[PDB]
Design a protein around this ligand. Sequence first.
Ligand code: A1BOO
Ligand code: ZN
Length: 139
Amino acid sequence: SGAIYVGNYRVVNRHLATHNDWANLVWEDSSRDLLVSSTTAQGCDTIARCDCQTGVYYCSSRRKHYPVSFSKPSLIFVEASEYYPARYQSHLMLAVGHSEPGDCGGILRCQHGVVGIVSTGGNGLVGFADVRDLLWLDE
Ligand SMILES: NC(=O)[C@H]1CCCN(C(=O)[C@@H](Sc2ccccc2)c2ccccc2)C1
Ligand SMILES: [Zn+2]
């Protein structure tokens, strides 16, 4: 679990969005596993606007942060799960690192701010949904 809180927006994994997220929907994209909802309170986070390919992520299943080298956002095949059919997930960045069910929503940060959130895992890999291209989150 986990979310990004920026301005009057909450960014969560689309497959973990709540009834309240859907009632206050701003934007969602099944191919990216992202959903953004509106909030009444001002958020605690800053979004990176950069091309970093190194950063640190929080892994809830280890209660630890880990440094990672990750690929640029791209279209990657993801196996069918209870949440989605087998499909290509877009804007996804992969890295070598631990990730298991429950780690979705952990934040990946670089020196410039929030880069994205955990969205996929298994086999000693961790995949992050990028948010750096969503410039409207800043306004
Ligand atoms: N479509 C998606 O964005 C995800 C929805 C939930 C299921 N997805 C996963 O990747 C799963 S279990 C997995 C393990 C090995 C190979 C494939 C999947 C998982 C594991 C670790 C962290 C987060 C999620 C895909
Ligand atoms: Zn950066």
